[PDB]
Amino acid sequence: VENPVETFRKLIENDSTLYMLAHSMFDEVPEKAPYDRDPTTLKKQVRNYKTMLYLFNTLLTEVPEYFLRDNPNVPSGLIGFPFNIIVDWPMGTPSGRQFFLDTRVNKCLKDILNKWNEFLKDPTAQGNGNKGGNQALIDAGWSSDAAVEQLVNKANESTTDKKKTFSEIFQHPANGTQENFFNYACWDNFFTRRFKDGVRPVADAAVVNACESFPLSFDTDVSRRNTFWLKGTPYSLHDMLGATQDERVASYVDGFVGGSVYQAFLSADSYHCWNAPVTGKVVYRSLIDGTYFAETAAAGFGGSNGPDPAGPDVSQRYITHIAARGVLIVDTNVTGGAKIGLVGFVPVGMSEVSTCDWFDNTEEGKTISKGDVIGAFHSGG
């Protein structure tokens, strides 16, 4: 019944170590430009946890702002991520890294971001009429030429069959136009929008892309467990798949030793649902609690690739081992399958896009078909 921001305030203030860290993670941000402003450069950087909490509570009833409409030339890495904007530089401090690895902090963040998700799913925008959720999107700038062109261009960049208008690409409610932001009832429906039929045809190949996504890494001959904290972040199957806390996945870890890991990134202006990469029978499915704003030391202040203006962007391999995430293991050695053994699909949250939503067609024992929509990321915890 308690406001989850208030629960977080109490956690910070009633624990001497967390109280210390919640000061030091701001004190360790340099005073000097550019760190006097957040990474968008549009606002002064937050310098204390009470202002942070005030803003977190305010954000519970806000959709992300498309700030590029009036500010087209500022850094755009954090479009969609209002909480991330506040803590991005603190995430890059030594005390901030410790703070955002604390399991109690992350339970509190989970509850805050899930309360946020309740608002983002609410077509009334918390009691502002049946169009409140839609109007919030328009007020936030998402029906601007800049936003809509960005969404259309991003969808077109991955195909030769380019479409001129948003409505030819994505499904949206009836009578939708740019002026009414396609009548999307709330942020969540916009965020998890589906492609129109035929816009993403399923390829004949045995393996298809599970996400509309940008290749990041391809690693061969991966180890059972590895030093994922060292530079370059070697993948650690045991940690990534959660064998730490579920012995039932341990046999799948063993079966992936020597295998390959492919990783790819979903931008804020990309399609966010998940499609089945192969045909087969689901043999294992899990959700794993973890971090939200944990990034590497290399991505922080004084780091060899830091501080990241959009953490955990440059830490994507690292967070596969600790972030809120999910695991799906598909057996393709079945009738209708490609007979390429077991295939794993591990969606991994980043910051406040960390709700891993498995659809019911992925229940263990069901067969999925290549190209079927099987889940989605949502803004949330």
């Binding site: 991003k154 960049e157 991955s158 195909t159 492609f195 993403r200 399923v202 390829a203 004949d204 190949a205 045995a206 393996v207 298809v208 892309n209 599970a210 996400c211 509309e212 996504s213 940008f214 290749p215 990041l216 890494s217 391809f218 061969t220 993948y235 199957l237 990534m240 992936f256 030793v257 020597g258 295998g259 390959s260 890991v261 492919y262 990783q263 790819a264 990134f265 979903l266 931008s267 990309s270 399609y271 966010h272 998940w274 499609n275 994507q316 967070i319 390429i340 053994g341 077991l342 295939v343 794993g344 699909f345 591990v346 969606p347 991994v348 949250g349 980043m350 896009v353 190209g371 990321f377």
Partner: protein
């Protein structure tokens, strides 16, 4: 957001991944969902 796909050693012997995925530094755009990622050889 980010995601991994994981393949077994013996399966990778049988598969040809597209270059944009196997050599990610060459990629300049999203890959289209449902489009080819790897084919049997």
């Amino acid at each position: 957001x980010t995601h991994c796909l994981i393949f077994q050693r013996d399966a990778v012997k049988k598969l040809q991944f597209i270059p944009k995925a196997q050599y990610p530094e060459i990629a300049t755009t999203n890959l289209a969902v449902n489009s080819e990622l790897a084919k049997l050889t």
